[PDB]
Amino acid sequence: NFNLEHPFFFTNNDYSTDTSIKYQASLPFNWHEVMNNDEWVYQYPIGKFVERQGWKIHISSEYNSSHELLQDVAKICHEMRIPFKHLSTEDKFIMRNGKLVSRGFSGKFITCYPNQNELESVLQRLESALKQYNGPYIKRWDEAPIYLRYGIKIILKEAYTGLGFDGTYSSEKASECKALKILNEWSEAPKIYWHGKHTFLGIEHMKGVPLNRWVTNNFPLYEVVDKTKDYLLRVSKIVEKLIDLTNKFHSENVYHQDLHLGNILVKDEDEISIIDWEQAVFSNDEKVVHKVAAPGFRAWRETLPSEIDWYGIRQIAHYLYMPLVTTSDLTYNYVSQTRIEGKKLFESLGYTREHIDYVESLLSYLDSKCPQIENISRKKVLKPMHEIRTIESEQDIQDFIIKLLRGFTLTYGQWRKEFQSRFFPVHYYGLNFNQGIAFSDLAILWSYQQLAKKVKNFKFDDYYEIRTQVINEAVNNFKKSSLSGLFDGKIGTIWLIYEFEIDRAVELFTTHFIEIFENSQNKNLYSGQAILLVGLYFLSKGEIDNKLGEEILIRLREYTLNYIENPETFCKVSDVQSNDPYENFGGLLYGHAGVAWLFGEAYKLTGESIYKNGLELAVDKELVAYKVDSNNSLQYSQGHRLLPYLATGSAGLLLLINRNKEILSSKYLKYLTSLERATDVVFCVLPGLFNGFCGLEVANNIYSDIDDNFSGQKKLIEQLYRYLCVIEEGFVIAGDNGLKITTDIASGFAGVAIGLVSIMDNKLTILPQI
Amino acid sequence: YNFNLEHPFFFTNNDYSTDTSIKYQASLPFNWHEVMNNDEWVYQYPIGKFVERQGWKIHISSEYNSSHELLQDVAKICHEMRIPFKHLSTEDKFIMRNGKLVSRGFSGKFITCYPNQNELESVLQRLESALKQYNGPYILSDKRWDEAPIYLRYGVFRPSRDDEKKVAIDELIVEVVKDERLPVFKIPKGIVPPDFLNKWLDFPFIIDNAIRFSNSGGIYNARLKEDGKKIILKEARPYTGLGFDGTYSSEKLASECKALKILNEWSEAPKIYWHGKIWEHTFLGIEHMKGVPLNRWVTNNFPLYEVVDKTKDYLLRVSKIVEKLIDLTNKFHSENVYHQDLHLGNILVKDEDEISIIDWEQAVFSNDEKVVHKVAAPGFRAWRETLPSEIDWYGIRQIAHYLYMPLVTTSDLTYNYVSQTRIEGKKLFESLGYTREHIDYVESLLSYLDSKCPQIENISRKKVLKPMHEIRTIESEQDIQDFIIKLLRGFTLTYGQWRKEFQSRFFPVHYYGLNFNQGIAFSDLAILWSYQQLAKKVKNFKFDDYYEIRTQVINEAVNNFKKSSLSGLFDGKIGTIWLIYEFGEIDRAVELFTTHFIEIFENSQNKNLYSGQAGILLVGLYFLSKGEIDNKLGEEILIRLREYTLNYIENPETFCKVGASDVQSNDPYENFGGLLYGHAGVAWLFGEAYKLTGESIYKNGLELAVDKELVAYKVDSNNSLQYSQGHRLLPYLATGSAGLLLLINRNKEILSSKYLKYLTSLERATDVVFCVLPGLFNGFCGLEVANNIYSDIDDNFSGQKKLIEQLYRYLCVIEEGFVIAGDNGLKITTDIASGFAGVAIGLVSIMDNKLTILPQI
Ligand SMILES: Nc1nc2c(ncn2[C@@H]2O[C@H](COP(=O)(O)OP(=O)(O)OP(=O)(O)O)[C@@H](O)[C@H]2O)c(=O)[nH]1
């Protein structure tokens, strides 16, 4: 679960390809170099009695004086004077030192391992080359960088720490204090209240909130908020304050170089306050590439410092129209599409035409300072969208899905050329779980063949040989890993192969079901034992061996009874604010809210009414966990994260409530239309099935009979157009936390694929029945 | 088929390669794309526009001094209307293709555009009128269009189309049209007349000899008219010829013209005759010298035998030439000229031992700088940015050390390689019998010369290859016991240094067999067989990791086993079965043998022991001699070997080629003849069959095999039998003479007394004091495994002593262990073809008396 990215695609930490300066050192007679740990090179003589542990000596230096210190230490230590190891990469030197890194290992550039009882002159000789150099502190021994071993009522700060890829220390970046002292006239900028040297310069804290919660409090997400319109008048007030103060402080030789979600702060009556003037450089003759900034805001390819801030001051006012800003690091000039997709939404709300046209003309004459920059790279293959249509007929939907299926083949094509480990592009969380109906290719292929089956007379190409050269390593790696479960576990592959090869899945299931089922302990649907769905699905049509079938049937009966006496125990029916799957709780993906499907299938099979009793017990244990929202409906309770979604929140609750009509009573149907009002929003900030808009639109209309749901296609496509970055004759959808492209079940090609095939075929084709 | 690629340590395949030059990037509007198809070009075409194949294309070239301006000056022309284009990616491929090491059929290819056939004049008039001040090379197999660089040709636009009939990707889509990519233009099967192009479409030297024609031309023999006499010509087209620096061909002929005009009173340096410029070419009239080079001078003068020196005085003949070289250094250094690249294709010695340095195509004229010796020879390549005067003196030093002993081919890999050679040279030159004054004078002049080239200490990561300064003599078995564990621990170090980075294979191999993976060849499993046969050979080993890697090599050498399709004993899917049998395991793959032995047998053509069915029959008779296969296939092997012998007896021409031929090479698939790669290994089957069955026809087949193999053996000046192809002699094991001595000496009682009299001549022929290669197929270790493998009496100690001493002459040292250098030594290879496993099985069979590489009875 770590992030390391190159342009265009996404990958893991294996793809580095470091190109820097090799360190290089000499070597005496009967000595050696070795790259043992692949991050340190170790020097050692041949014949010497090496002990274990003892003492270690650490020496740290600055960036510029590394190689001459290395030469002096080498000429001291090579002549029968102790083995030696050091850092092996100039590129990794700025991650070992510099800015905020891991607290356990920081510094420690030069290391030696003395032979216990010979230190009477080595430490004395190490002040010869030292005592005039420098370095970070990381315990002190003398007046030299020689060490021994066996953050942020005035808010303050702290000062060789903070080095980037260029030479700019955090103490150096002087710039902040000169920018504060030349801008002490205005109360929007903070004041300086401490001078001198670990230096402790302080600032005044202006009141306010960050603009993201201002967007969630002022930019509408439900239709009942912000009565009598007039929100665009406030938006005009903030952007007129930005243009006024921008023209006031760009008079005399000062620039900010970053105007992201930070450094802006609105208190009351639309009063901004720019804080933390830290990245202040100024020139107007040479051109500088924008080096360091927040994600979503990055200037391009060696322009003037007057127009570095141009893109930032355009975009900071641009996403106030409709906030989708984080995907501009991949698609240059992305923000044109947000304007035209916010204008139609604002007209659909019913705002005044004067306010909308004034805001559009205001952004137009801010764009009147318009220096495009024809950047020259390989990122420019993914050009923006400049065409917006309207869906009325079914052939438009067929054209959209045959366009979208091409982008899947195109994002498959470029992945195989430079990478060989997996078969398909990934998300950053589940980039190694290469099995099951989860973040894995085996769940991608059957969505592909389904949507090839649905549309029209598709080209057969060569996907037969592709499917067999996928299923060969699938049956190879059925068992060479750990864990168990349905989604990313063990026997989801059996269900997918049977839903794909019939006989092999049946005989692996009947030879491994009792062996794998007793190994797992939990009962949740992700990686537990509810497996019972696969067993009941194989039992209802009938392919299981008989006597083991009744044995596992009375087994699941007695675990159902045992669950009837005990509390929830295995899961919680969790005040953590995370998107993380293992930390997720209280949903259909994670919790006891999904066992209602398992109880309902057993009730639906012949006659078992103890599973009905399990249904009332499960819903009575599950209904307490949800808090109420403003619009009189149930909502997920933890933090300020009021997200009604398929997982955790309201949409999964509406899915589980309307699962079976026959089990319902008048006590159950007390929150039907209020919960439907909960899942009726004008904006979803991230797309997808598990954590996005597509799961909401699936849960809004799945089991309300009929098939003619063209309002559903209209709403889904006309709200899904805002998330797409176009390629040649196709689309590739950026996933959740979107900076790169993603193809998985949650946020990718397969999410939209499963969503559309579930809306067309109203059975929601995950966790099956019959 | 060769696939050579530079890499520090081990030389590998074309996979470790990253372009680190300034890349070329263009801009695209909407409805355009940037497909990167096949790693050379980047494809660009408007989206939705059907490109019409099978028309006319334009090749555009450029110079290195201004090429970006061609990109940003022709980009709006392709942006206007509809023109696809594809251009080269980085500057490194532009250097590699607009240079000197690339073929003339593919040179000058930078921009390729794709017009339609109906728009050619309209695009050509627009692009021609804006490129007046651009210029570049000619590009072969095209024709001149106007004055701007524009060259047309007939070529392939796209691959095969969507849903109609295609036959190829290169020919006419009308009869077959073969590709004729030669530096001429071809109009195939008449012409459909291009009305845009029909109007536009319509020396005091005599040629003597072309020694080369290279890429930029080069040295060209001819005859002058107004002066007569003999002359040579150097030619150089403008804007071609390019190193890894801004430097062209015409920037060096002017430099050597200056360097040969500044000095004129030296009779052994050539005099300029006519430095004229025909058209834009730079021709050059240079006189010719008589004589032979030093590279072939040591072939017939260095004592290879111990009688060939013709009554002493060889070292004085060395010393006069050496003092002639050391005299002619500061004579032209007074003019402050400097001549780089002092390799041994420039010092030519004529009659009465007079020298003449003839190649001057690198010449600086100032000395305060440190440059990389960028263009050099194999062996004389210098050591990272010293001043050019000591670069020249370093070249002089290694000239003198090749004159001392003729191995300097690996001095690029190990710094101060001259140390080991200078240590062994006194023992080489004192073991033959010479006066001490000559050796004293040679070492005195060398000890004068060695201090004018200053030593350096940086080495740059190849530090673990140190020269050897700790030599010993062999007079006890404990020396052999120490050497075997040292070599084995060095092989462990080799596996440790190979396991770090690469994983496509398991062991380092020579670059000939860089793709093969099985058998007693360039492989993996035979190396562990040698490892096991040497590890328990003394008493034991530590065995830190041998068990799990043995399990690994068997369960991914046996699991696939059929991915490649090739037959033979050496590398051909049945030697794999033999190594599984002889590793110490159970017979195991006998089921696979009975499954597909007839299938492997029935679909092969060659019958040599390298990759033919003769080794398959040897494996079969070995398994029948072990005593358990089946009741039926044992009869099938005999009923096939019967009439396999008879097709050879009635017609020996099909199974092998007799004669000497005209081939000077080292590739394993070319050199016919000899014990392994030819005819002399056929009689090994007849010997094994006679030792199993005992009947006369096998003996007669062996006698005819020995009779018809000895045709291609030319007698030396001394009484010695030598294998000879071309102008070279081959007294080696594989394609040589020591292979026949095994066949004669092993079957001594079977053979009659008529063929037993050749042993006294082949013992003289396989007795040299010097070799150039440290190997056993084609090297040294095979020449003294034939000496003591089957005598009668156990006298292993003296032969072992000689082998270990001359291997100390050839080895290289890492840590406490040891490595060895393979064929074409610039690297470290560990296999059974001039590697660690070969010297391992040599040290096995030198006292075990078996020669375990070939399966006996
Ligand atoms: N000057 C001269 N050259 C000859 C003679 N005979 C052959 N040559 C040619 O000189 C060439 C020397 O080429 P190399 O030794 O490869 O060196 P080079 O290719 O000239 O490159 P540089 O050594 O950098 O000039 C040979 O390839 C021969 O073709 C001769 O008598 N005199």
Side-chain angles (χ1 to χ4, degrees), chain B residues 592-632:
Chain B
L592 297 170
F593 180 64
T594 50
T595 305
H596 38 83
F597 155 69
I598 181 59
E599 173 200 325
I600 293 158
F601 211 96
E602 271 293 326
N603 55 5
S604 190
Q605 276 286 100
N606 48 0
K607 271 89 173 177
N608 288 14
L609 287 178
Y610 196 42
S611 71
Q613 80 183 16
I616 315 302
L617 285 170
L618 190 53
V619 169
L621 276 70
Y622 184 46
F623 270 129
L624 269 70
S625 181
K626 290 327 273 173
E628 58 88 20
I629 176 65
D630 73 315
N631 70 305
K632 176 37 55 163

Side-chain angles (χ1 to χ4, degrees), chain B residues 657-677:
Chain B
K657 169 184 145 151
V658 290
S661 188
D662 299 321
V663 159
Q664 205 289 167
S665 169
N666 212 28
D667 178 86
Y669 289 99
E670 311 275 29
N671 54 3
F672 298 102
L675 174 64
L676 299 197
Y677 303 167

Side-chain angles (χ1 to χ4, degrees), chain A residues 210-430:
Chain A
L211 265 295
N212 50 3
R213 47 197 66 206
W214 180 261
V215 159
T216 62
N217 288 335
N218 288 262
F219 177 80
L221 188 153
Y222 276 104
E223 204 175 2
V224 309
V225 74
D226 189 64
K227 257 84 171 175
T228 73
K229 315 299 169 160
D230 196 74
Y231 152 79
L232 285 169
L233 193 141
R234 277 86 68 190
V235 176
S236 76
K237 269 201 258 181
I238 295 90
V239 303
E240 83 182 356
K241 288 321 182 283
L242 273 70
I243 187 173
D244 219 334
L245 278 71
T246 297
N247 268 326
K248 290 176 72 67
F249 82 97
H250 291 88
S251 160
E252 192 43 71
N253 277 18
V254 54
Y255 304 91
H256 203 289
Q257 272 83 15
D258 55 354
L259 275 297
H260 67 298
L261 179 57
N263 300 114
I264 192 66
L265 185 65
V266 170
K267 45 179 72 66
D268 202 36
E269 196 271 330
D270 294 332
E271 288 307 306
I272 67 174
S273 68
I274 301 107
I275 200 167
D276 196 77
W277 298 71
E278 189 177 1
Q279 212 70 28
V281 291
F282 64 101
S283 87
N284 272 317
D285 43 352
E286 293 83 4
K287 305 165 284 185
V288 171
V289 177
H290 202 171
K291 302 169 296 296
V292 58
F297 302 94
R298 265 190 81 257
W300 305 81
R301 205 180 77 89
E302 190 90 337
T303 65
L304 287 169
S306 176
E307 53 182 1
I308 300 299
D309 216 351
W310 173 66
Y311 174 45
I313 67 180
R314 196 262 297 274
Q315 202 172 10
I316 191 70
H318 210 95
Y319 65 94
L320 308 173
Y321 204 75
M322 183 278 288
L324 297 167
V325 65
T326 180
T327 175
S328 76
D329 298 340
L330 187 153
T331 296
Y332 154 74
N333 205 23
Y334 162 72
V335 298
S336 61
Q337 183 60 254
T338 53
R339 195 186 202 177
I340 187 168
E341 283 291 324
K343 173 177 160 60
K344 294 194 301 302
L345 189 148
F346 267 51
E347 287 168 340
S348 171
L349 262 69
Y351 266 68
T352 76
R353 198 169 271 204
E354 190 276 331
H355 275 172
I356 282 165
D357 202 280
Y358 174 65
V359 164
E360 177 161 316
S361 68
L362 177 43
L363 267 72
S364 191
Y365 76 91
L366 271 295
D367 204 80
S368 73
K369 160 191 22 207
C370 21
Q372 78 88 29
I373 291 296
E374 282 296 326
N375 55 1
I376 315 166
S377 184
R378 65 199 295 204
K379 268 205 206 180
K380 220 160 68 184
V381 187
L382 276 158
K383 299 159 277 165
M385 210 166 187
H386 63 87
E387 53 272 15
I388 288 301
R389 297 283 76 78
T390 317
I391 307 292
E392 286 98 1
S393 59
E394 57 91 23
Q395 47 98 22
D396 291 331
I397 310 153
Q398 306 264 36
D399 198 69
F400 170 73
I401 62 170
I402 193 66
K403 263 200 172 167
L404 180 51
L405 188 153
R406 190 99 159 90
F408 175 54
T409 58
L410 272 295
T411 189
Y412 171 59
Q414 293 93 70
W415 173 241
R416 292 303 270 168
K417 304 222 191 93
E418 293 83 3
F419 281 98
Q420 203 44 270
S421 173
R422 298 187 74 256
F423 270 17
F424 281 97
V426 298
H427 199 231
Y428 78 105
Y429 271 133

